[PDB]
């Protein structure tokens, strides 16, 4: 389940490492590089974690799903953590069946892949 979503993360973070050298010259950068910075900064913020606070995979895969598929781009970076802690609280009361199925099966069916999109956009609406 984590391998399915974490695939492009590994590539986006490398592209971010390459482009971050350009941030000091931001005035004359391509829109593609602007998008790359927007995505990579939010991915880097998303991977912060507090001590003594380990997450189960059921809680990890939704967060990395939101990060990888760009749902974070519409959120101000300075509160991505506030998003994440809230987002999980949403999933654990609405769509808790999805977390149960991620725990039980350990893999994402196409139904679950679509449901993650639907739930993520339902939350990110607010």
């Amino acid at each position: 389940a984590l391998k399915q979503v974490a695939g492009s993360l590994k590539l986006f973070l490398a592209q971010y490492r390459e482009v971050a050298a350009f941030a000091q010259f931001g005035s004359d950068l391509d829109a593609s590089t602007k998008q790359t910075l927007v995505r990579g900064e939010r991915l880097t913020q998303l991977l912060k974690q507090n001590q003594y606070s380990p997450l189960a995979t059921e809680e990890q895969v939704p967060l990395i799903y939101a990060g990888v598929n760009g749902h974070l781009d519409g959120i101000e970076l300075s509160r991505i953590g506030e998003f994440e802690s809230s987002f999980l609280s949403y999933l654990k009361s609405n769509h808790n069946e999805l977390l149960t199925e991620i725990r039980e099966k350990g893999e994402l069916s196409k139904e679950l892949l679509a449901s993650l999109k639907s739930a993520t956009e339902s939350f990110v609406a607010t």
Binding site: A21, F22, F25, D28, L29, D30
Partner: protein
Amino acid sequence: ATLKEVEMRLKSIKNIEKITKTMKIVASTRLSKAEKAKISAKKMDEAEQLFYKNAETKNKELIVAITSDKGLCGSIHSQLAKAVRRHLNDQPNADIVTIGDKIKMQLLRTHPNNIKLSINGIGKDAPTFQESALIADKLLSVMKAGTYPKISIFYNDPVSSLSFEPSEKPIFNAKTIEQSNVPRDLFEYTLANQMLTAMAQGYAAEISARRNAMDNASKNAGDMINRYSILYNRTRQAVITNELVDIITGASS
């Protein structure tokens, strides 16, 4: 040449090389924007030169010299200064209007007498019609451009993305264009457009030259990195050997 010294110098040159590569790609980016203004200006300049060509117009002096005043452009400013000096030695009586601080510095290191106040600071970006028209008006009112028997404009022609050439162009005064009040206004307007196109070509040449200069800088820094990596490996082996010799001598006392 301690291991720490070599490692620090190697890291410094690595930082320089990365900076130069980044600037090289940034220059390649600005080149795409510059090309559009260059094309736009070139169309209009050719269109209005076709009038003087069809009319078969032909020929104290006013020499305008165009550079951006930006550094790290390499051979740009010195090449244009060379061309300007070669021209000026044939007509020392000419008064000069340098656009750009660097070329003003060039024509103050040599032939300082020929200009009191240079036009500086405005040559940053691709030519705006407002800026070019205002500079032409300054030449007319401040430089008394309306009076000179002969006018020349020097700029760097962007011969290629990889090369450029110092180039000079005449402007026929109102009394000069009369031969095959309207001529005076058209003279001022033609000077404005000619200067705009020359400044566009200069901007394109500047950005191309900066691209190539940063490319060369990055390649040179890479060569230096190779040399200092070799030296670092040698120093590493030497340090290990010397420390181990000290230890072995201590043991075998």
